[PDB]
Design a protein around this ligand. Structure first.
Ligand SMILES: [Cu+2]
Ligand SMILES: [Cu+2]
Length: 128
């Protein structure tokens, strides 16, 4: 099966997908984030951050607290299963992670931890 997905978010908080399926036969999985648009990362940055559903709230909240110079992620956050950098317009970042970190049956969410962006850019990731 395929083991990659392309994800983009613009200056308008508009993104291409709210649901990612990771096939169970993938050993690694890659997310390629891009940002169409004209605003820089300090004004309208986006990241892609993966945790269980239950951990999403805390990761988001602690991330906002940590600020731009930490890419809005609390340092050393063991709840983050994988994540891209925070990017701004015209930029691109890709993360490849080990699919052995995911357990069929558990509920995962992906999301942007830039302040407030969690409300509009988030989604489910499922291992099938
Ligand atoms: Cu395959
Ligand atoms: Cu964003």
């Amino acid at each position: 099966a395929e083991c990659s997905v392309d994800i983009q978010g613009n200056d308008q908080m508009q993104f291409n997908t709210n649901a990612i399926t990771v096939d169970k036969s993938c050993k690694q999985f890659t997310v390629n984030l891009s940002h169409p648009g004209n605003l820089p990362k300090n004004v309208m940055g986006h990241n892609w951050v993966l945790s269980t559903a239950a951990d999403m709230q805390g990761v988001v909240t602690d991330g906002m607290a940590s600020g731009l110079d930490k890419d809005y992620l609390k340092p050393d956050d063991s709840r983050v299963i994988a994540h891209t950098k925070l990017i701004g317009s015209g930029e691109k970042d890709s993360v490849t992670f080990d699919v052995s970190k995911l357990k069929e049956g558990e509920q995962y969410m992906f999301f942007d931890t830039f302040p407030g962006h969690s409300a509009l850019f988030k989604g489910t990731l499922t291992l099938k």
